[PDB]
């Protein structure tokens, strides 16, 4: 049965057992690529440090 | 008073409240550059990932 489940993305994430777009995140102080498969949860997030794009970046990549 | 304290480096580290050369280390799960000053201890170690030195490395650095 194809059911169109509505609701908040933090609810659709827990219904779908996935992470969708605007769900709550689980930032837990260590890196997601350090976790094994069984301890990765859908929602394990990571806010990376920034990087300023410059003209030298464009030149070196081109 | 000057005292030449002998012993193992893991003992001289705890006597001098420093880390010396061959003491036991407190390798934990997170990065020592993430800790503040009051939660750094002398002995907070980090085994970094490797980097293979190649001829291209020598050329680009020269």
Curated annotation (Swiss-Prot), chains A, B:
Swiss-Prot/TrEMBL induction comment: Activated by cAMP receptor protein (CRP) and integration host factor (IHF). Inhibited by PaaX.
Disruption phenotype: Disruption causes the conversion of phenylacetate (PA) into 2-hydroxyphenylacetate (2-HPA).
Function comment: Catalyzes the hydrolytic ring cleavage of 2-oxepin-2(3H)-ylideneacetyl-CoA (oxepin-CoA) via the open-chain aldehyde intermediate to yield 3-oxo-5,6-dehydrosuberyl-CoA. The enzyme consists of a C-terminal (R)-specific enoyl-CoA hydratase domain (formerly MaoC) that cleaves the ring and produces the highly reactive 3-oxo-5,6-dehydrosuberyl-CoA semialdehyde and an N-terminal NADP-dependent aldehyde dehydrogenase domain that oxidizes the aldehyde to 3-oxo-5,6-dehydrosuberyl-CoA. Can also use crotonyl-CoA as substrate.
Family (UniProt): In the N-terminal section; belongs to the aldehyde dehydrogenase family.
Protein name: Bifunctional protein PaaZ
Organism: Escherichia coli (strain K12)
Part of the intact protein present: 495 to 556 of 681
């Amino acid at each position: 049965q194809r059911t169109a489940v509505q609701g908040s993305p933090t609810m659709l994430a827990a219904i779908s057992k996935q992470w969708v777009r605007g769900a709550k995140v689980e930032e837990d102080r260590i890196h997601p690529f350090r976790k094994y498969f069984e301890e990765l949860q859908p929602g394990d997030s990571l806010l990376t440090p920034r990087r300023t794009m410059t003209e030298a970046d464009i030149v070196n990549f081109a």
